[PDB]
């Protein structure tokens with residue numbers, strides 16, 4: 185068994201590793217410092233590299249490829265991540281590879297997720313912090329949207345905090361590229377964060393703007409989003425719930441109304457919000 189590089193630039197398979205030894209390439213070229221997370225996808229470890237001594241994160245699938253479709257779905261994440269490319273507010277992928285039917289993604293190391301930060305804070309985030317995260321996530325989304333890419337999974341768990349109040353959008357596994365001249369396939373998203381038009385099958389960049397709006401609403405007001413039912417509909421009528429949003433400033437409330445616009449024809453784009461006075465810093 186040997187590891188093979190995974191990339192969608194056409195490269196077939198673009199030191200310190202001995203194929204003869206039984207230990208896998210992941211074990212030979214890294215030291216596992218800690219386990220950042222785990223779930224149905226597999227595991228994420230913090231690691232240090234031996235080629236350049238920098239710190240990285242590695243995500244690995246749980247169990248070997250069931251079939252060609254299972255392999256193709258998992259590898260597509262590498263392809264979607266490459267379409268994003270290098271941008272300051274997007275998690276950067278170093279390299280990805282497969283060995284033993286296991287997929288590995290190596291990225292830069294980032295801090296805790298917005299979700300973890302909010303759980304530890306145990307309350308609504310201070311508004312000043314919220315503006316920074318909103319601005320950086322809008323910049324990430326403006327980058328994706330300018331290339332015809334929709335993230336489809338914007339939420340606190342997929343936003344990663346950095347030093348000095350900055351953050352990065354990550355997890356491009358559900359990313360799709362818009363194209364009536366090309367092709368595409370869509371996976372199931374988190375219903376709590378779903379834009380209303382997705383129910384009727386209309387996909388576009390505006391869905392991400394709605395998801396970010398629900399994301400900011402959740403962390404700025406410490407509010408649990410509903411999966412369905414009347415509460416789910418109440419958030420998609422264009423009216424904010426008065427009880428939770430009371431403490432919010434006029435500027436943030438007004439930005440939230442624009443992002444939560446039910447009609448995707450009328451919803452603000454990321455480029456447009458970033459040109460508003462508060463966000464144009």
Ligand SMILES: Cc1cc2c(C(N)=O)c(N)n(-c3c(C)ccc(O)c3C)c2nc1C
Nearest residue numbers: 220221228241243289291293294354355356
């Ligand atoms: C729990 C967790 C932490 C990190 C992480 C980090 N603390 O730095 C990182 N970079 N990812 C990551 C990885 C490893 C691959 C592709 C990708 O989009 C992302 C956002 C992480 N994922 C998870 C699930």
